[PDB]
Design a protein around this ligand. Sequence first.
Ligand SMILES: [Cl-]
Ligand SMILES: [Cl-]
Ligand SMILES: [Cl-]
Ligand SMILES: [Cl-]
Ligand SMILES: [Cl-]
Ligand SMILES: [Cl-]
Lengths: 174, 174, 174, 174, 174, 174
Amino acid sequence: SSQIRQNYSTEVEAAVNRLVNLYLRASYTYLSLGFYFDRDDVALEGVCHFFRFLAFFKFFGAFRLLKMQNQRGGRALFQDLQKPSQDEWGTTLDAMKAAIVLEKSLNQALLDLHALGSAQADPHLCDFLESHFLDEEVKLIKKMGDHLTNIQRLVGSQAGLGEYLFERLTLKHD
Amino acid sequence: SSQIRQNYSTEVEAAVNRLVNLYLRASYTYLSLGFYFDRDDVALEGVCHFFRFLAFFKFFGAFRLLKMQNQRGGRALFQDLQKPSQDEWGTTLDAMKAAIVLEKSLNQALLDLHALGSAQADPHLCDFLESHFLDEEVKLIKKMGDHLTNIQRLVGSQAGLGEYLFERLTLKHD
Amino acid sequence: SSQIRQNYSTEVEAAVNRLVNLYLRASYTYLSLGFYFDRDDVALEGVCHFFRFLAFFKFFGAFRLLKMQNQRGGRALFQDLQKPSQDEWGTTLDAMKAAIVLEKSLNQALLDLHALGSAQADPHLCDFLESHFLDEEVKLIKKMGDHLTNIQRLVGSQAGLGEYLFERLTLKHD
Amino acid sequence: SSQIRQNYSTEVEAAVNRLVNLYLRASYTYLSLGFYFDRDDVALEGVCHFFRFLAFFKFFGAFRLLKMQNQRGGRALFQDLQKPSQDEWGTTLDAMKAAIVLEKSLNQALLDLHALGSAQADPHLCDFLESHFLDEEVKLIKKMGDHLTNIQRLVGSQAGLGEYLFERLTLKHD
Amino acid sequence: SSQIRQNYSTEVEAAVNRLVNLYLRASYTYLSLGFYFDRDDVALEGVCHFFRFLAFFKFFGAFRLLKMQNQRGGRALFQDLQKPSQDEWGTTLDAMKAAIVLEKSLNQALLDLHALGSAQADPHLCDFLESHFLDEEVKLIKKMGDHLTNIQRLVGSQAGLGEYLFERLTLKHD
Amino acid sequence: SSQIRQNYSTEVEAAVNRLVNLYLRASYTYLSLGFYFDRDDVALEGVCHFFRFLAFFKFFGAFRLLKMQNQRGGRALFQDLQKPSQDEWGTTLDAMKAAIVLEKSLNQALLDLHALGSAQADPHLCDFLESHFLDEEVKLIKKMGDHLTNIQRLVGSQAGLGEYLFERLTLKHD
Ligand SMILES: [Cl-]
Ligand SMILES: [Cl-]
Ligand SMILES: [Cl-]
Ligand SMILES: [Cl-]
Ligand SMILES: [Cl-]
Ligand SMILES: [Cl-]
């Protein structure tokens, strides 16, 4: 058995491995979103950069979980990674709606793992999620919600104009 | 005969001279585009500067070809340079469409010369085009395509508004 | 159809998408290798850092391919990503042998794509692979081969001693 | 009609467009002169650099005229550009004689345009030529004349020696 | 067999070893040229330094080939090195003519190896020659041709005078 | 005859030319040793760098002799250079033993030339060897002897371990 493992349930160990798969799935979804908005026939650089950054950020979340798994003496186990849900992502509005759906799913997975940890009396797990994941997720979802509202107010009856303006004047670009 | 020339066909030498004429023609087209957008009755500074820069960039391509001609021991031969295809260039959209047509023609000329070089077993010629021309051309055409998509999304039903916004918020100006 | 695409076959476009999948598979394999050597019951930091860096490097290769796909006017298409071939990776020797097998497979995929590009008279594709992939791969495989030889000479009859010494004195660590 | 144009005759507008053609012709002549002296079988670097600089300087003159055309509310119109008068330019002496002939022709065109402007009571045109063209031209022709005299004194009965010495000791080179 | 070797023919491996011998032969020829022009009864320092630098440059070419041989998993094999073709090298003109003959022979060997690589579908080999050898060779041969033309124009009927002047005013010396 | 030569025998002149051949032979031997230890199946970087440096150092010795030949008014004469004695160099121990054999042969050649110079009452020759060659050779042979002793003490019954340790902990590497 493990020489370091202490107060670390098999249930938590397995749930952490599943959460890693979810975050890597999310990372891959954002990679696809980024390259869609980089297409010459889409060409919204600020949108591309927004999702490319999220791809890296979700990968970092997976990395932290994996590090924690080893710190606790669990065994990182990797599974197949499903492709993203779409090949083409429509408008900025469509994409930001898909992103907030994705983030809510990751948030619920975080809350579910926190509840498991609490049931298992695993305070290191609970604190780890609180300190590195829960607030970052709330902050990101608030940001997406802010963006959705601004995108929606810009649709009006000149959708193209508003999509350009949002990309130019809210999102970070060269 | 030439004291330095080696593995340099007459076919390649002649094709290089024709390519120089094509690039100088392109340079002159961009000079005309630039001065059109500088007119007081057109007055799109970012568009003017975009095409003025391309005039210089295409001249630089011609210059590099001429330098290479001499490095290989061929003889630079200059022909008459035809004037651009238009005197007035319409909207930014019209102009960017003409530019991408022009660039595709230069790209095809590059690919044709590369194929001639390959047929003639002239690896210095092939590498020269690969290293200094092919990727620069792909990059430029991608940029133009990005611009066309952004211009097209801004037309809407307020063409003037969108043409101003594109010039202000995408193209580089004072 | 595409407004920028020129001299870019459907065969190459599809092969690039498959190559992206191969590089992301390789990246994921290296992520798993890295976290195995980070285990408290394996604990070879220099080996962990070697494979973690390769995970990032292979991801970067996939990223460059995807960027190129868009520059040429092809469509990035993502498929499911299979999990790595093993859950536990044995000794440093075992792992470095698996790594060189993996790299040879990526190298053969590169050479196959280069041959397709050459058959299709696609010099931009050929140059792209030459300039950004082929030499990096040769260099990496040479490095792995150097490492294998040093690992093999250290096995002797005190395998543990040699595995520690290699990690301490050849691989980069804190 | 034009919203800015004032005191700008059609005669001057047309003459400015013709002068642009003359300066671009001169620029192209100097480009050809430069590349001739860059040939491996000519190989006079200081002579190459002298004419390359003049190619740029004459292009700059054309550019200033075009800018002025727009500032006055005239319409820049570009015509075909004839190739230079020669494909091969003989000795430095031959080339410098051709250059001074060329410059005298540009100078006479300047003086003719100034006279037209004066007849048309167009003081902005007259001042523009005085301030940016007439003295630069006098200065250049004086310099060429200085060079011709030095070249002629070096011919003697060892033409090759003198042509080398002039290039080395008067003209600017690496 | 080799643990790293992939897509590297025996034909290419052998041809690389022969090319190393050719470059080391060339290096030795330049060493001899340099020391001839350092003789008190020849005493042309700029000529000495020109050929001494080429001795080092050709050695560097051999070194790069040898490094590449190992990177590909071939076996560097060294053969006897023949002495240079002459013990005394005549005038600067004689020497520069011998040098351009030598360089054309190295260039043809490069082109022959590139053709072998292409026949063998060895793109790493082809790119290696393109990126590190072909253009450097074209550049050097152009430089030599420039020098030959300047030497030839200085012969006149005062050969000694012209040989001194060329060494003083074109070649780099203290 | 020579305008500078004084007190410089034909015997010394010829012996200097032979010594140059010996040092260039030694340089080539070290080049081969270096590239052997750079092989992926040998892979001892510190050993590679040790012999690569000696290749350069022996070349420098040959260069100094050639310079001296000219300073004295003798004629540098180059002969064919035989290939090294081996294609593969065995262990570090084997290689260092071959190196000390080589160095002892160069040292004896130095001492023989010094004795010839002394017999010929050629104090400039004697001082030249004393000041630039004899002590450098003694120092190098002492260093090699130190290395041999350390290599021999590390063989024990785990030859691979000791060869790695010597390369890592005594020889200079990245
Ligand atoms: Cl799926
Ligand atoms: Cl026309
Ligand atoms: Cl699988
Ligand atoms: Cl004409
Ligand atoms: Cl021989
Ligand atoms: Cl032998």
